[PDB]
């Protein structure tokens, strides 16, 4: 147990520690950790939330930290990392007020008010546009600390196609449900080799060889029960008492396979995409009648596949009719690097799309997952929100800059306070330069004039080698992200602050 | 002897761990469990039932914390703080060969008078019932981390209690089983909503389900959807190789038949308690029944009274008369999870409160904030009075309670101004969290009070001894009343042991 | 293993010692005891029996000083801390015989001499009375020490009240079972919202909400068995061979409940109360039937039930006949705290009652009991005996007094037998004194002239400081706890004075 | 630090060495309680000067000069 | 060890201020640590502290108040 300065300062100390650990992952130049445990292993990212879920916080401060990233990741996709450098340097800028002898409350007040100012600044000075030519940038900005290759701008392009794929419009709002975007990646090395699919990707393979190597205008089938033997609940006995009935029932038990057969094919089902699985003797008519079948498919796709071809999840196959048959102009299997896959196109919906991903070593490709995740986010949030902000501390030196015009506006003791949020904003600008291996101090001394002097989007300029102009360069953080971040940092910074007692 | 000097320790020490987390400068606790389980909170009940205790004198001053929670929900860390004070100051009187019998009468006759005084002091609530209530229930929003928000919250708690107050004998009952309560992180603070019906964290049970059903006839089943097999042993015999889908089929007739019966009711949605087999799964599915399973207990009674619904336990006999009604039941995203409202209840005087929070520790507490203004606010509705916060009314009742002293003179009197002394606890508490010089506060309290200023207490932001219940600082006069109880409760007992084995 | 002077001696120390952890729980300004086990945890009381039952004792002799007050409080109900004290002060004063010389042996048969003559003189000088006016006074006196709040004239009056209301009369005599008189508590806060049933409660609920929430002139069966589906004692095994039959069997089930509850409606019984349990179905037709059931009712309750409402309890349903069920002008259940409960009021038989217990905190409530206990007990006796006798150290100053005068009339060696048992009887005043912090040799100073003067019921007058009259105060002693007390002392003096070896 | 008090107490008169001691304590307790007020060690310190400058002058006040019952007077005091 | 050192000196070469120069040492010390993170370097903070104190070393005998009287001398000890 901890009571007071003891608690506090140390909490402080917890907070800042952990969030130093992924410091060094922002922005372009950013570097990436390496996380290994006992038996999965070597994780290697540079991904804010990875790089902590899977970190091991023992301190419960710390663990709170950690808390944002996982949120943020969840809620917006973008900004872990800022989130929790951000809470870092909140508790850490309060620890001087704290020092002075200004109350961990006050400081909580002069946090919210700073932070309910920001948001309104940011959504006073946020630029408005939806056209694929920012939402490409967004894309291209969401990939940069990341080990994606050269590649990136396909990616971008891959990600602002998918995105506007699946975008719909209903009351006048485009939503854009990141659901229908299955993203799926195979080792085979490449990167550019990733595909976009107008339709659903499944990593399965037909369940039976003679099965059709393609099925074009295909009438699909989702079975959510196996095409297999099943037992009455109350349990049962079979007494023979003549020899011949043995064969018999033998029998009993082809002929009911014969019909699960029989009921498919009478649909009009062509392909059986099954939840669970399938018997070889079930498998040999399947073959038999012509039918592509794949065995045990993931519940998660068999939703996607539901509602990208139109069909119904049908369990009993006595209600499989032709009526809860899904679409799609192809069905076929294709061997996608070591692995074959079963590709469905032309599905009666077509606002569900996927994104192949390829690369090589697999520490490559999951990564690229990552980033390419982050992306689709992002570009689709900001397909919804059309708004979008100056990327590379650009947003932050400005609201630096009028928050600690607003602090003066303010109270003794809140001005402080929020002069103190003032700073912990710089925090951003300041490790984009110190990772880039430029000099902090002197690019926020230049960052801040040049912002003051209207210049809103001037950034950290890693290329200038120091400040310059995010516009030019496109470097565009979205919005939601943003505010989220600050947000998050905000609640969690006072949650910890109020802590004058751990036990 | 020795024992009393340990077992009062012991306890104080209790009190004093919760004693910084008192008022609008209060400070918060971190609990970390032997599971690593963390509990950030201001709430002194959670401080104290959380805490691991050992000492039974301190078990018995956290037997304080739940009980004042228990009744009245807002005040054990002022009911601890209260019961330190009467124990430290009890300390001193033993010390002058005072009898611990004699302490205890006078303490509990002190305890009487100063409750007493709390009606008399207290003050009905007029036709300012809104503006009265939204200021108790900001006041308690005030120590609590939710402040940000205390406005928002406060009309929030407000609203909620207002709808679910039946107004019997021109006086108000409250019943919580009418505000469902719910908490989903991922959004800010501001964003905590009301809404009209009662939310179940819950998604539809099957893929094919609607995700919306308008004028919804609600079956609430407390029984699974599943083949019933009998009692006695049971065995299928088969001789004959036909008969075996003959009983397969027999079997699906039976769930089949289930979902028939629920339909054939005219239900439109099924809330089960428990599971729903995968089979009756889509047949209601088929059927177009929305159905969700394996729902919270406590919250299949909440959608009962709301829709109006009875839960049934016994498919067989499941009546139209048995089922619930709502305007329309949906499946709606909040945020990353899928949740069913059930708006538009039979029953108006139910409705829900979506806590938000942008962190799981961050909405626990901002979950447990606001259920203390609806305590309030309801408690405060219910009893039709309230008193001036900020310790004025302890400073009142302490200062009354010097004068009764000097009526039921003796030893007695020594022990009833102790009880005074102790009471003035809360205005130090107040005073010395935010930084204000307890003991200036104090005289100046005490001045005021002296020349009958009844609701001067102190203004913790100014640090000034203002009018309380002019500033707004005012709570439900039942807050009051129950800490000192609970609070002479625990002194006397710790008080009358003179010994502790095992 | 010890021999003689050592055993001894040491057996005498063992006694005063446990008889000491309860000596300042004695009277009116007395204390607690606050006993802490391993899971169940802390309890608090100042009923000497508990604090020793509950107490860890290992020395041999200590634990039979213990078992007297097991015996007083199961026999005679109040006196358990005086009998030990009393038995410790027996064999302290018998330690100095022992050294001057004399036979444990003629000390234990001074003992008898002294006690069986106390046994007479107190039962000369008892006073009689059974007015409710004195019976109010044996309860104000029993719940002293206590801690019960200020409530006590309240309690004493529900005590009187219960016992009248219980109180049979035969040949001539009035008996009390104090069995009919049914105690319970819920801590809800109040100690004053102690209500007393004119009937029996059960701390139970009706088993299914669709019940009557009350029952008018109600019909009750007591069932002994559980209303569920039961098996033949022969292992039973059903082997269906036809579909069909699953459901007939399901059904049989059903039709079984449906005629229990059939069964129990044919009766005429609206209320069910069964010792058991009740399956669901049978609570659906119960329910639809509008009868009122609890399931699973303690035995014990069963029983006072049975008594209480005249009914018959019946196991076979078949049994289950009009001349079997009981009679309450109302069943009716009710929230008494936080939880519901059962009250079955106007009894066929008035002779049963109960009283709910109210109070807070939890320990609070169950001692409250324990205390409102030693009163109806008292209450009881005296109501029988009719006799009692004057409190407060009274009793036992008269008796010292003449028992040291009958010591003269007596020989050598029994002579200085019967003069210790006198000075051990001093033992009362001088505790009462004690504890209440006064001084306790000027006290029985004083004490003993005034009974000497004839004054036989000046006590020890805590609130005069000192001695005082008890007459007045109404502090009286129940005849009969006296005696057992005196009578279960001599006992145990005797046995372990016996005990020249202990091994 | 106490015992130093009786020493010194012993050195200067020679009785009243466990009054000293007593009152030691007494003003310790005492503190105990102010101190918890919040009462500055200062003010306390000031006070209890103070008040011990006044207890003096107070005995001076409430004392006798021994007169011709020097005798007795001193025989009483042995 | 090094802020000892401090108090010493202050004390055999001044007297008075060793609590403040101790004190002092922190605070410079402390406030440096933020101009340290902020990637101030080291020596640039060292020569801050110089110009400041040497600075400071004049207002100071620019402000200070000359008397020699006992009045003073008086108020000094005080
Ligand atoms: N090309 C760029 N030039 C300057 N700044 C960039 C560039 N790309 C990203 N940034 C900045 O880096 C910060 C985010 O770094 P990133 O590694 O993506 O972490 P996070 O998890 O917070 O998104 C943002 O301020 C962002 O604008
Ligand atoms: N705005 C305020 N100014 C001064 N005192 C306040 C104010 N708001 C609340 N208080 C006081 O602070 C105490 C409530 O603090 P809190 O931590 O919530 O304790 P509790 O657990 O007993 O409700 C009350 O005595 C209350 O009147
Ligand atoms: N009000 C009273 N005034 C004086 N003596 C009392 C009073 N009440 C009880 N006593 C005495 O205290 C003794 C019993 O104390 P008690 O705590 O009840 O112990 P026990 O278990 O032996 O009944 C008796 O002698 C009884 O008369
Ligand atoms: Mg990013
Ligand atoms: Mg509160
Ligand atoms: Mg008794």
């Given at each position: 147990?901890?009571?007071?300065?003891?608690?506090?300062?140390?909490?402080?100390e917890?907070?800042?520690?952990i969030?130093?650990?992924?410091?060094?992952?922002?922005?372009?130049?950013?570097?990436?950790?390496?996380?290994?445990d006992?038996?999965?292993?070597?994780?290697?990212?540079?991904?804010?939330?990875?790089?902590?879920?899977?970190?091991?916080?023992?301190?419960?401060?710390?663990?709170?930290?950690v808390?944002?990233?996982?949120?943020?990741?969840?809620?917006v996709?973008?900004?872990?990392?800022?989130?929790?450098?951000?809470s870092?340097?909140?508790?850490?800028q309060?620890?001087?007020?704290?020092?002075?002898?200004?109350?961990?409350?006050?400081?909580?007040?002069?946090?919210?008010?700073?932070?309910?100012?920001?948001?309104?600044?940011?959504?006073?000075?946020?630029?408005?546009?939806?056209?694929?030519?920012?939402?490409?940038?967004?894309?291209?900005?969401?990939?940069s600390?990341?080990?994606?290759?050269?590649?990136?701008?396909?990616?971008?392009?891959?990600?602002?196609?998918?995105?506007?794929?699946?975008?719909?419009?209903?009351?006048?709002?485009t939503?854009?449900?990141?659901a229908?975007?299955?993203?799926?990646?195979?080792?085979?090395?490449?990167?550019?080799d990733?595909?976009?699919?107008?339709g659903?990707?499944?990593?399965?393979?037909?369940?039976?060889?003679?099965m059709?190597?393609?099925?074009?205008?295909?009438?699909?089938?989702?079975?959510?029960?196996?095409?297999?033997?099943?037992?009455?609940?109350?349990?049962?006995?079979?007494?023979?008492?003549?020899?011949?009935?043995?064969?018999d029932?033998?029998?009993?038990?082809?002929?009911?396979?014969?019909?699960?057969?029989?009921?498919?094919?009478?649909?009009?089902?062509?392909?059986?995409?099954?939840?669970?699985?399938?018997?070889?003797?079930?498998?040999?008519?399947?073959?038999?009648?012509?039918?592509?079948?794949?065995?045990?498919?993931?519940?998660?796709?068999?939703?996607?596949?539901?509602?990208?071809?139109?069909?119904?999840?049908?369990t009993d196959?006595?209600?499989?009719?032709?009526?809860?048959?899904?679409?799609?102009?192809?069905?076929?299997?294709?061997?996608?690097?070591?692995?074959?896959?079963?590709?469905?196109?032309?599905?009666k919906?077509?606002?569900?799309?996927?994104?192949?991903?390829r690369?090589?070593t697999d520490?490559?490709?999951?990564?690229?997952?990552?980033?390419?995740?982050?992306?689709?986010?992002?570009?689709?949030?900001?397909?919804?929100?059309?708004?979008?902000?100056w990327?590379?501390?650009?947003?932050?030196?400005?609201?630096?800059?009028?928050?600690?015009?607003?602090?003066?506006?303010?109270?003794?003791?809140?001005?402080?306070?929020?002069?103190?949020?003032?700073?912990?904003?710089?925090?951003i600008?300041?490790?984009?330069?110190?990772?880039?291996?430029i000099?902090?101090?002197?690019t926020?001394?230049?960052?801040?004039?040049?912002?003051?002097?209207?210049?809103?989007?001037?950034?950290?300029?890693?290329?200038?080698?120091?400040?310059?102009?995010?516009?030019?360069?496109?470097?565009?953080?979205?919005?939601?992200?943003?505010?989220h971040?600050?947000?998050?940092?905000?609640?969690?910074?006072?949650?910890?602050?109020?802590?004058?007692?751990?036990? | 002897?020795?024992?009393?000097?340990?077992?009062?320790?012991?306890?104080?020490?209790?009190?004093?761990?919760?004693?910084?987390?008192?008022?609008?400068?209060?400070?918060?606790?971190?609990?970390?469990?032997?599971?690593?389980?963390?509990?950030?909170?201001?709430?002194?009940?959670?401080?104290?039932?959380?805490?691991?205790?050992?000492?039974?004198?301190?078990?018995?001053?956290?037997?304080?914390?739940?009980?004042?929670?228990?009744?009245?929900?807002?005040?054990?860390?002022?009911?601890?703080?209260?019961?330190?004070?009467?124990?430290?100051?009890?300390?001193?009187l033993?010390?002058?060969?005072?009898?611990?019998?004699?302490?205890?009468?006078?303490?509990?006759?002190?305890?009487?008078?100063?409750?007493?005084?709390?009606?008399?002091?207290?003050?009905?609530?007029?036709?300012?019932?809104?503006?009265?209530?939204?200021?108790?229930?900001?006041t308690?929003?005030?120590?609590?981390?939710?402040?940000?928000?205390?406005?928002?919250?406060?009309?929030?708690?407000?609203?909620?209690?207002?709808?679910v107050?039946?107004?019997?004998?021109?006086?108000?009952?409250?019943?919580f089983?009418?505000?469902?309560?719910?908490?989903?992180?991922?959004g800010?603070?501001?964003?905590?909503?009301?809404?009209?019906?009662?939310?179940?964290?819950?998604?539809?049970?099957?893929?094919?389900?609607?995700?919306?059903?308008?004028?919804?006839?609600?079956?609430?089943?407390?029984?699974?959807?599943?083949?019933?097999?009998?009692?006695?042993?049971?065995?299928?015999?088969?001789?004959?190789?036909?008969?075996?889908?003959?009983?397969?089929?027999?079997?699906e007739?039976?769930?089949?038949?289930?979902?028939?019966?629920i339909?054939?009711?005219?239900?439109?949605?099924?809330?089960?308690?428990?599971?729903?087999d995968?089979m009756?799964?889509?047949?209601?599915?088929?059927?177009?029944?929305?159905?969700?399973?394996?729902?919270?207990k406590?919250?299949?009674?909440?959608?009962?009274?709301?829709?109006?619904?009875?839960?049934?336990?016994?498919?067989?006999?499941?009546?139209?008369?048995?089922?619930?009604?709502?305007?329309?039941?949906?499946?709606?995203?909040?945020?990353?999870?899928?949740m069913?409202?059930?708006?538009?209840?039979?029953?108006?005087?139910?409705?829900?409160?979506?806590?938000?929070?942008?962190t799981?520790?961050?909405?626990?507490?901002?979950?447990?904030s606001?259920?203390?203004?609806?305590?309030?606010?309801?408690?405060?509705?219910?009893?039709?009075?309230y008193?001036?916060?900020?310790?004025?009314?302890?400073?009142?009742?302490?200062?009354?309670?010097?004068?009764?002293?000097?009526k039921?003179?003796?030893?007695?009197?020594?022990?009833?101004?102790?009880?005074?002394?102790?009471?003035?606890?809360?205005?130090?508490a107040?005073?010395?969290?935010?930084?204000?010089?307890?003991?200036?506060?104090?005289?100046?309290?005490?001045?005021?009070?002296?020349?009958?200023?009844?609701?001067?207490?102190?203004?913790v932001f100014?640090?000034?001894?203002?009018?309380?219940?002019?500033?707004?600082?005012?709570?439900?006069?039942?807050?009051?009343?129950?800490?000192?109880?609970?609070?002479?409760?625990?002194?006397?007992?710790?008080?009358?042991?003179?010994?502790?084995?095992?």
């Open positions: 147990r901890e009571q007071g300065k003891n608690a506090q300062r140390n909490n402080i917890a907070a800042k520690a969030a130093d650990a992924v410091r060094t992952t922002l922005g372009p130049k950013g570097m990436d950790k390496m996380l290994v006992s038996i999965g292993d070597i994780i290697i990212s540079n991904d804010g939330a990875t790089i902590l879920k899977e970190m091991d916080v023992e301190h419960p401060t710390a663990k709170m930290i808390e944002v990233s996982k949120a943020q990741d969840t809620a996709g973008d900004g872990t990392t800022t989130a929790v450098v951000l870092g340097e909140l508790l850490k309060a620890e001087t007020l704290l020092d002075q002898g200004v109350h961990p409350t006050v400081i909580s007040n002069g946090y919210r008010l700073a932070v309910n100012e920001a948001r309104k600044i940011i959504d006073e000075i946020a630029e408005k546009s939806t056209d694929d030519a920012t939402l490409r940038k967004i894309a291209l900005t969401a990939l600390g990341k080990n994606t290759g050269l590649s990136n701008d396909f990616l971008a392009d891959l990600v602002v196609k998918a995105v506007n794929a699946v975008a719909e419009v209903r009351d006048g709002k939503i854009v449900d990141t229908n975007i299955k993203v799926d990646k195979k080792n085979g090395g490449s990167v550019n990733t595909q976009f699919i107008s659903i990707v499944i990593d399965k393979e037909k369940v039976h060889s003679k059709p190597d393609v099925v074009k205008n295909a009438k699909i089938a989702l079975i959510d029960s196996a095409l297999e033997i099943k037992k009455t609940e109350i349990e049962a006995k079979v007494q023979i008492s003549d020899p011949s009935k043995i064969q029932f033998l029998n009993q038990e082809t002929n009911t396979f014969k019909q699960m057969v029989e009921k498919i094919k009478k649909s009009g089902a062509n392909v059986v995409l099954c939840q669970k699985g399938i018997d070889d003797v079930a498998q040999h008519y399947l073959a038999k009648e012509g039918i592509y079948a794949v065995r045990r498919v993931k519940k998660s796709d068999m939703e996607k596949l539901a509602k990208a071809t139109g069909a119904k999840i049908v196959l006595d209600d499989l009719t032709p009526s809860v048959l899904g679409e799609a102009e192809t069905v076929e299997e294709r061997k996608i690097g070591d692995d074959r896959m079963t590709f469905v196109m032309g599905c919906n077509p606002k569900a799309v996927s994104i192949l991903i690369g090589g520490h490559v490709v999951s990564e690229v997952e990552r980033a390419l995740n982050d992306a689709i986010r992002v570009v689709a949030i900001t397909k919804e929100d059309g708004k979008f902000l990327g590379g501390g650009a947003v932050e030196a400005e609201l630096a800059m009028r928050l600690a015009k607003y602090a003066n506006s303010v109270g003794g003791r809140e001005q402080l306070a929020i002069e103190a949020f003032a700073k912990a904003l710089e925090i600008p300041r490790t984009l330069a110190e990772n880039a291996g000099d902090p101090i002197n926020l001394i230049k960052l801040k004039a040049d912002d003051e002097k209207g210049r809103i989007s001037v950034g950290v300029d890693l290329d200038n080698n120091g400040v310059g102009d995010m516009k030019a360069k496109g470097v565009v953080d979205p919005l939601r992200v943003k505010t971040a600050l947000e998050s940092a905000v609640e969690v910074a006072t949650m910890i602050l109020r802590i004058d007692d751990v036990i | 002897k020795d024992a009393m000097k340990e077992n009062i320790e012991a306890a104080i020490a209790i009190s004093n761990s919760v004693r910084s987390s008192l008022g609008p400068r209060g400070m918060d606790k971190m609990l970390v469990d032997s599971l690593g389980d963390i509990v950030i909170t201001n709430d002194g009940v959670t401080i104290l039932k959380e805490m691991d205790v050992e000492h039974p004198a301190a078990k018995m001053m956290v037997e304080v914390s739940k009980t004042q929670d228990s009744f009245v929900g807002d005040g054990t860390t002022t009911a601890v703080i209260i019961a330190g004070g009467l124990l430290q100051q009890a300390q001193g033993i010390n002058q060969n005072v009898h611990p019998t004699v302490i205890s009468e006078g303490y509990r006759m002190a305890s009487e008078e100063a409750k007493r005084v709390i009606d008399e002091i207290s003050t009905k609530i007029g036709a300012d019932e809104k503006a009265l209530l939204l200021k108790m229930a900001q308690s929003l005030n120590s609590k981390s939710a402040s940000v928000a205390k406005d928002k919250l406060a009309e929030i708690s407000y609203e909620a209690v207002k709808s107050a039946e107004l019997r004998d021109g006086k108000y009952y409250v019943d089983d009418n505000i469902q309560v719910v908490k989903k992180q991922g800010a603070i501001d964003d905590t909503q009301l809404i009209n019906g009662i939310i179940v964290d819950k998604e539809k049970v099957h893929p094919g389900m609607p995700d919306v059903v308008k004028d919804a006839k609600i079956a609430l089943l407390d029984a699974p959807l599943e083949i019933k097999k009998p009692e006695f042993d049971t065995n299928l015999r088969i001789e004959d190789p036909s008969m075996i889908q003959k009983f397969l089929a027999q079997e007739n039976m769930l089949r038949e289930m979902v028939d019966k339909k054939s009711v005219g239900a439109n949605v099924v809330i089960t308690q428990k599971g729903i995968d009756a799964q889509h047949y209601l599915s088929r059927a177009g029944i929305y159905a969700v399973r394996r729902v919270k406590s919250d299949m009674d909440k959608l009962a009274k709301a829709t109006g619904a009875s839960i049934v336990s016994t498919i067989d006999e499941i009546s139209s008369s048995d089922l619930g009604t709502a305007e329309r039941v949906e499946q709606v995203k909040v945020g990353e999870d899928y069913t409202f059930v708006t538009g209840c039979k029953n108006p005087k139910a409705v829900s409160i979506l806590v938000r929070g942008e799981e520790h961050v909405v626990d507490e901002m979950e447990r606001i259920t203390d203004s609806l305590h309030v606010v309801a408690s405060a509705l219910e009893d039709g009075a008193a001036a916060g900020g310790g004025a009314t302890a400073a009142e009742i302490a200062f009354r309670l010097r004068s009764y002293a000097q039921i003179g003796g030893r007695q009197q020594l022990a009833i101004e102790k009880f005074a002394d102790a009471i003035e606890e809360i205005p130090r107040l005073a010395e969290n935010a930084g204000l010089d307890p003991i200036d506060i104090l005289l100046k309290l005490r001045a005021e009070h002296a020349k009958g200023n009844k609701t001067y207490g102190i203004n100014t640090g000034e001894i203002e009018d309380m219940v002019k500033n707004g600082v005012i709570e439900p006069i039942r807050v009051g009343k129950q800490a000192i109880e609970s609070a002479t409760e625990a002194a006397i007992m710790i008080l009358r042991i003179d010994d502790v084995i095992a």
